Design a protein around this ligand. Sequence first.
Ligand SMILES: *[P@](=O)(CCCC)OCCCCCCCCCCCCCCCC
Length: 278
Amino acid sequence: TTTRTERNFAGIGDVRIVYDVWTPDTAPQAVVVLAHGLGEHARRYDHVAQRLGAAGLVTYALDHRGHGRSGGARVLVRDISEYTADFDTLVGIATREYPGCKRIVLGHSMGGGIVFAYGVERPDNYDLMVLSAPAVAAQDLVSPVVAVAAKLLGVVVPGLPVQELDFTAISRDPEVVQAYNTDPLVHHGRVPAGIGRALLQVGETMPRRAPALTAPLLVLHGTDDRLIPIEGSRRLVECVGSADVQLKEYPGLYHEVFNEPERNQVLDDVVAWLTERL
Ligand SMILES: *[P@](=O)(CCCC)OCCCCCCCCCCCCCCCC
């Protein structure tokens, strides 16, 4: 039995960051710090934290600024460092509450881009990285001219909606898409320029920065992902400095592998990967 507690801290710029803590009723094996994707929130990951809890893992999952229960203007960010700083603070919170426990940083989509940028900047603040379709190659979705424009707009008008997303691409399960379509805490609009710039900054420097990752890395990706092409994850595992890197491709799965029909096989692979290394 894994149980959720809701807590908070003061993030960068004194924005209240809400985060959940999922504690299992068994002896804690290690801690997981989880970063959700664009426009979603940590409560869409309940079933993930429960599955990890059944493996004796404590899961820290924060609502990013402008997301879910956290403060700030909705999906507003002026720099990727705002996300990575709030994630860094959350990693430190788990490090102090569970000292000596191994630390697993886990990110999905934009969360995967934040976990990546956090990791290459603090490659010894964590022990294991798991990335679910990380948004580390956003510049492959637009022309270079559009990337020049989006970076500039992310500065001047970070709140301007700039890019529409196909929400039907998140899952092959129509129930998942409809539950996403009707979630009051999900951003039901377009990608803003500020987040567009942040993802583009991470993407252009991913090849040059990835060598800084030295901890074991697990990348998960569905082959039929229309939001983030799988080639972005193939280029990532070819570019990281980690010796123990692995990409699990899931034939036919859509973007959110954690919410797919095959999600239990996906999470079985995550637990199996973590337990060989803990
Ligand atoms: P993840 O967080 C999954 C959430 C979506 C259900 O992110 C998925 C992919 C996000 C990529 C967004 C596009 C990044 C670049 C967009 C900027 C280009 C638009 C600029 C137009 C200027 C004329």
